[PDB]
Amino acid sequence: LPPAPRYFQGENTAGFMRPVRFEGDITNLEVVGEIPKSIEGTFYRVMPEPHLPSFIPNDPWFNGDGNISGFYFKDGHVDLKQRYVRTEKFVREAEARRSLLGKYRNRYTDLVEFKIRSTANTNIVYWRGQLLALKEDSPPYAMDPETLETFGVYDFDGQLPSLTFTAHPKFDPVTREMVCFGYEAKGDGTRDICYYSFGPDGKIAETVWLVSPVCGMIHDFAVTENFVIFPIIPLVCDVERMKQGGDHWQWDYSIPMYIGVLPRRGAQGSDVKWFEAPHGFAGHVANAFEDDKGHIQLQMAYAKDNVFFWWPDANGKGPRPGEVEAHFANFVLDYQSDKLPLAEPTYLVDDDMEFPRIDDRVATRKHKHTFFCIFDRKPGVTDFEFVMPRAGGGAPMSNGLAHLNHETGDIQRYLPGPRKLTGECIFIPRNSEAAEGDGYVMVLLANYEDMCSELAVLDTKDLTNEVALIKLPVRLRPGLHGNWVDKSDVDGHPAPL
Amino acid sequence: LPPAPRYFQGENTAGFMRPVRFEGDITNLEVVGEIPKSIEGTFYRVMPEPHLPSFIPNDPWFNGDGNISGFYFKDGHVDLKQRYVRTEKFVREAEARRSLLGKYRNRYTDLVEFKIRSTANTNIVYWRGQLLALKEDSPPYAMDPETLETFGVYDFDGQLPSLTFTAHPKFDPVTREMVCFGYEAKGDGTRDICYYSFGPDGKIAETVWLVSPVCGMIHDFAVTENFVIFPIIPLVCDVERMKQGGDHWQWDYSIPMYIGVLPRRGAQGSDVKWFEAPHGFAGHVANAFEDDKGHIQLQMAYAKDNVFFWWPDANGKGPRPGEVEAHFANFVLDYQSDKLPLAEPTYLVDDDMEFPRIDDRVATRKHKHTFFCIFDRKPGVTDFEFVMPRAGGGAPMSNGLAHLNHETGDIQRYLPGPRKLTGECIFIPRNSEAAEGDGYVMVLLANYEDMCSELAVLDTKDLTNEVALIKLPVRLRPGLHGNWVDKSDVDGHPAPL
Numbered sequence: 001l002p003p004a005p006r007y008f009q010g011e012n013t014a015g016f017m018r019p020v021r022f023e024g025d026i027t028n029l030e031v032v033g034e035i036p037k038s039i040e041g042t043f044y045r046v047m048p049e050p051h052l053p054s055f056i057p058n059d060p061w062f063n064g065d066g067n068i069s070g071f072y073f074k075d076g077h078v079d080l081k082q083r084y085v086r087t088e089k090f091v092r093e094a095e096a097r098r099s100l101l102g103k104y105r106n107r108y109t110d111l112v113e114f115k116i117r118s119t120a121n122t123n124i125v126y127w128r129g130q131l132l133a134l135k136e137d138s139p140p141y142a143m144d145p146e147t148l149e150t151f152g153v154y155d156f157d158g159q160l161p162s163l164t165f166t167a168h169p170k171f172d173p174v175t176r177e178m179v180c181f182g183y184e185a186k187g188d189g190t191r192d193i194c195y196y197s198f199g200p201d202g203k204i205a206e207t208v209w210l211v212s213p214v215c216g217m218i219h220d221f222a223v224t225e226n227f228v229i230f231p232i233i234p235l236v237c238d239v240e241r242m243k244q245g246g247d248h249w250q251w252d253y254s255i256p257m258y259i260g261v262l263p264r265r266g267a268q269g270s271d272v273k274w275f276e277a278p279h280g281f282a283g284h285v286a287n288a289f290e291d292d293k294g295h296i297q298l299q300m301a302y303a304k305d306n307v308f309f310w311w312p313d314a315n316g317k318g319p320r321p322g323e324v325e326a327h328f329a330n331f332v333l334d335y336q337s338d339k340l341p342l343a344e345p346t347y348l349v350d351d352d353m354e355f356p357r358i359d360d361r362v363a364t365r366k367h368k369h370t371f372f373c374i375f376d377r378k379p380g381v382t383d384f385e386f387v388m389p390r391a392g393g394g395a396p397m398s399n400g401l402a403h404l405n406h407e408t409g410d411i412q413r414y415l416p417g418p419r420k421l422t423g424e425c426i427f428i429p430r431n432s433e434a435a436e437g438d439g440y441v442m443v444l445l446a447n448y449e450d451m452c453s454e455l456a457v458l459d460t461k462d463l464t465n466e467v468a469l470i471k472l473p474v475r476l477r478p479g480l481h482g483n484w485v486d487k488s489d490v491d492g493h494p495a496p497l
Numbered sequence: 498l499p500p501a502p503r504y505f506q507g508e509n510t511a512g513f514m515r516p517v518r519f520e521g522d523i524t525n526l527e528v529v530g531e532i533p534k535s536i537e538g539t540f541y542r543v544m545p546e547p548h549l550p551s552f553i554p555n556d557p558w559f560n561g562d563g564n565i566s567g568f569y570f571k572d573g574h575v576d577l578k579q580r581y582v583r584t585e586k587f588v589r590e591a592e593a594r595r596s597l598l599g600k601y602r603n604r605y606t607d608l609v610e611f612k613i614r615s616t617a618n619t620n621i622v623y624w625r626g627q628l629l630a631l632k633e634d635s636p637p638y639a640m641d642p643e644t645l646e647t648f649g650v651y652d653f654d655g656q657l658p659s660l661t662f663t664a665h666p667k668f669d670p671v672t673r674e675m676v677c678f679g680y681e682a683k684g685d686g687t688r689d690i691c692y693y694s695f696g697p698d699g700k701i702a703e704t705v706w707l708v709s710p711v712c713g714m715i716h717d718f719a720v721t722e723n724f725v726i727f728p729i730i731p732l733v734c735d736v737e738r739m740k741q742g743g744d745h746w747q748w749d750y751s752i753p754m755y756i757g758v759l760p761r762r763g764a765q766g767s768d769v770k771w772f773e774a775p776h777g778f779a780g781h782v783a784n785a786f787e788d789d790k791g792h793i794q795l796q797m798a799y800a801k802d803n804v805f806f807w808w809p810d811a812n813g814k815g816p817r818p819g820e821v822e823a824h825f826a827n828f829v830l831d832y833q834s835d836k837l838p839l840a841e842p843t844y845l846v847d848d849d850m851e852f853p854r855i856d857d858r859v860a861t862r863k864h865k866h867t868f869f870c871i872f873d874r875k876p877g878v879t880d881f882e883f884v885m886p887r888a889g890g891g892a893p894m895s896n897g898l899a900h901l902n903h904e905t906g907d908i909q910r911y912l913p914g915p916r917k918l919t920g921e922c923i924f925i926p927r928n929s930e931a932a933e934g935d936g937y938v939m940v941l942l943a944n945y946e947d948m949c950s951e952l953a954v955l956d957t958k959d960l961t962n963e964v965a966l967i968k969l970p971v972r973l974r975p976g977l978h979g980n981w982v983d984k985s986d987v988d989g990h991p992a993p994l
């Protein structure tokens with residue numbers, strides 16, 4: 001077999017990116033300042049964190065075993081619980097005490113035959129009394145919200161119609177539906193998209209099979225009152241390339257950024273329209289909604305080149321690390337239009353941004369508040385001389401958060417400091433009567449001075465000020481998505497506005 | 498109540514002394530080099546690690562909640578399990594989410610009435626299928642060796658005759674007895690010493706009540722074939738001082754270092770003889786044995802002033818941090834002698850030393866190998882400019898290990914490096930046929946460059962060379978005692994030579 005290394009090597013596991021691989025508890029976390037005593041609930045987040053050194057050199061960040069953090073808040077106190085998802089990969093590798101799964105989404109490089117290749121490392125959501133640990137090549141893994149025990153692969157009581165479940169389902173605050181899809185829904189290289197939804201009682205509602213023009217990466221999607229929308233990243237899969245040991249994904253400069261629009265209820269596969277946005281990278285969706293004219297306003301991060309630069313085109317063409325900016329774009333779509341090409345989007349702010357969150361009490365409807373990560377290259381904002389030698393590689397960088405008020409155009413910016421970077425934030429309603437976007441924001445910080453993690457708590461009334469700073473004595477490696485589950489929400493999701 | 502701080506403050510919890518307070522698992526630790534594949538068993542160690550910030554300012558290191566580490570070795574692989582002892586203190590403070598126990602060994606400063614005040618933080622030994630977490634003011638807490646679950650206060654099936662159980666019981670490799678004592682055995686300030694022992698079947702054997710000339714700290718003791726020996730540190734307890742909120746311990750410059758000798762079997766309390774060594778600090782016992790003439794050779798660390806300088810004399814007089822050195826002393830005692838004053842000891846090496854270990858297969862008999870911590874002030878051995886600002890305070894420093902061959906007088910020194918310090922080592926027999934002192938030594942390192950801990954594995958054939966260096970991505974705070982439990986030993990203790 002390829003040799004199993006006994007310590008981590010390479011930039012993707014150096015410095016702050018070095019795996020810690022701890023599971024367990026740290027109660028009564030140290031707090032500077034004061035956590036508002038009315039906050040009650042749990043911040044769950046997932047990070048890729050390789051449990052064993054890979055036999056693949058420079059294995060991408062996205063291929064790391066999912067490790068779940070829960071920060072449990074009550075009466076101004078907070079406890080951390082941490083546990084790896086017990087995926088097939090995790091368990092078999094733990095038994096063997098070495099890596100067995102090979103290249104990202106390339107089963108032909110695996111040392112044993114896996115049934116499920118999930119690292120369950122991308123998102124962690126709450127649904128009907130369970131956590132679901134998500135990875136877009138796989139079904140969810142169900143977990144206990146209190147103990148973080150893994151129950152196993154979750155197939156929604158045998159109803160799951162797809163081999164794949166997106167990392168970005170949307171929760172309709174009015175209907176209480178979980179709206180879902182999977183791409184490559186019939187396996188590697190398939191152009192099949194399965195769109196499906198579940199009512200609050202757990203029963204499957206929609207199931208529509210449609211066909212993508214290319215086998216392209218559909219990382220995120222959007223949902224409005226009457227439509228679902230599928231933006232395709234111009235990374236394309238060829239299984240023949242994979243069989244020869246090549247990458248699952250390869251950029252294609254010759255295609256548009258497709259944006260599929262399908263009626264949300266009662267559609268057939270052939271009802272999809274594949275609009276063609278200017279070539280670019282489909283970043284995360286803030287939210288979409290239908291305006292007065294019935295046109296879809298799709299607000300999302302959007303770049304003009306390949307953000308995943310480690311997967312270049314067939315001739316190795318692509319950007320360098322740190323080159324590509326994504327901007328907060330607004331695309332207008334009209335399902336009734338027979339014109340497929342779309343105009344360049346308008347931009348809501350100038351910042352290089354990503355990881356947008358809204359008040360999910362208005363998800364799928366008109367929103368007027370967005371919170372997002374920013375990367376400001378202005379001299380001094382980040383002390384690169386100090387940070388970069390300690391940072392390692394393979395993950396995106398954020399040196400602040402921003403809050404945009406869409407009505408007034410006002411922006412507040414939170415800068416944690418010159419030697420700190422941020423993850424994706426969460427928004428917490430102040431209480432059940434709070435106006436849209438009014439409450440608290442939390443975000444995990446990487447502190448490169450201490451080489452420790454911190455959890456910052458902000459009040460939306462003044463995003464520049466930390467109300468509390470929770471000081472972890474360990475590192476939580478840079479992660480992907482996370483969610484707030486408020487104690488006052490019986491089904492884990494906030495009530496509609 | 499006195500205010501409960503929400504983060505740690507003061508030198509005793511700064512830098513590398515900052516509590517981490519993690520409990521859980523880190524499997525498949527990173528290894529540089531190669532752990533010998535034939536090593537099979539577990540290294541257990543205990544550290545004081547406050548679970549909650551103290552309401553006592555500059556609370557001594559010795560008053561921190563006991564946290565148990567287990568390093569489980571097999572086939573060249575190693576896993577860490579870590580868990581706090583569930584003492585009465587730990588549980589009640591966890592329930593309250595604040596500190597309740599007050600000053601070290603002073604119940605009159607507690608905010609609630611405790612039955613047991615143990616932090617179980619000083620030693621962790623194996624006995625008849627359980628771990629015993631030891632603290633000299635208390636009975637042991639029994640724990641599961643595999644899971645580190647706490648069973649509870651242990652009273653040896655109702656046989657324990659004493660309120661107190663030493664942190665330093667001895668295991669007779671021939672008789673398989675556990676030889677024990679407790680001082681202040683009838684409560685705070687009492688001069689009662691209870692000497693007691695247990696046969697390998699768990700039945701109590703000896704129980705002798707004797708009387709100390711002063712109520713002094715007896716941290717360690719020695720056992721030979723026919724005698725038990727009690728060296729008294731000139732720290733003295735006055736309960737009236739404690740009732741007014743004062744320290745349990747106060748140095749007394751006017752008294753000798755008493756060394757009590759009692760017949761090991763069948764004695765009465767009045768058979769003890771209180772020999773009087775020159776004034777000084779009774780450090781840890783390497784081992785004691787009877788020579789050809791039946792004279793006791795007692796080998797122990799010995800200082801000429803108060804190592805515990807934070808507990809000075811009645812007028813506040815004593816040494817500064819880092820001033821007092823301890824030396825490896827040999828005291829000769831003759832039980833038949835009626836002359837109480839003893840001569841100054843001879844010294845086996847010149848190093849400032851402590852924490853001596855022998856091959857416990859010859860415990861209570863003649864030994865010819867000792868392994869010990871050293872602190873070498875020779876320029877360059879420790880980079881103090883770098884280390885001291887990161888070190889915090891309250892714990893002793895060791896910048897190497899030494900191996901003395903007592904026959905040849907040869908010494909080997911292991912220096913982990915200029916920016917690393919060590920804990921107490923353990924010795925592992927190479928195999929069941931190994932000669933005395935032949936095998937492996939392990940020791941936990943504090944790495945001040947990385948602010949991480951490491952576990953070094955050494956071969957006794959060349960102590961200067963690390964065969965393996967196990968790299969932890971967290972800190973294990975400086976700790977107290979630890980023990981090896983070999984998988985090949987049915988009762989957890991090695992067979993006699």
Ligand SMILES: Oc1cc(O)cc(/C=C/c2ccc(O)c(O)c2)c1
Nearest residue numbers: 086087088089091092095116152153
């Ligand atoms: O030694 C083996 C061989 C094998 O062929 C399969 C397994 C385990 C499978 C598995 C374990 C845990 C999971 O959560 C899961 O989805 C699958 C273990």
Ligand SMILES: Oc1cc(O)cc(/C=C/c2ccc(O)c(O)c2)c1
Nearest residue numbers: 062121122136219282283284354396
């Ligand atoms: O910084 C960004 C921006 C973005 O728009 C998307 C991602 C992540 C996508 C992803 C895709 C596939 C995976 O398997 C996975 O773990 C993550 C990261």
Ligand SMILES: Oc1cc(O)cc(/C=C/c2ccc(O)c(O)c2)c1
Nearest residue numbers: 011307321322392393394395396397
């Ligand atoms: O060797 C390096 C150094 C570095 O500073 C950054 C990267 C990668 C950047 C990146 C990784 C993942 C993403 O999802 C993304 O948007 C950006 C790689």
Ligand SMILES: Oc1cc(O)cc(/C=C/c2ccc(O)c(O)c2)c1
Nearest residue numbers: 583584585586588589592613649650
């Ligand atoms: O008056 C009280 C109130 C309380 O809330 C708890 C206790 C004791 C708890 C305890 C728990 C575990 C132990 O091992 C132990 O010795 C004691 C006593």
Ligand SMILES: Oc1cc(O)cc(/C=C/c2ccc(O)c(O)c2)c1
Nearest residue numbers: 559618619633716779780781851893
């Ligand atoms: O550096 C040294 C040298 C020594 O000879 C003894 C000790 C520790 C003794 C101790 C005494 C009472 C306690 O309660 C405790 O946790 C520890 C530390």
Ligand SMILES: Oc1cc(O)cc(/C=C/c2ccc(O)c(O)c2)c1
Nearest residue numbers: 508509804818819889890891892893
């Ligand atoms: O507040 C402080 C500051 C400091 O710089 C050092 C100490 C303690 C040192 C120490 C020295 C020798 C020992 O055996 C021991 O247990 C502790 C305490």
Ligand SMILES: [Co+2]
Nearest residue numbers: 167219284481
């Ligand atoms: Co995403």
Ligand SMILES: [Co+2]
Nearest residue numbers: 664716781978
């Ligand atoms: Co000791």
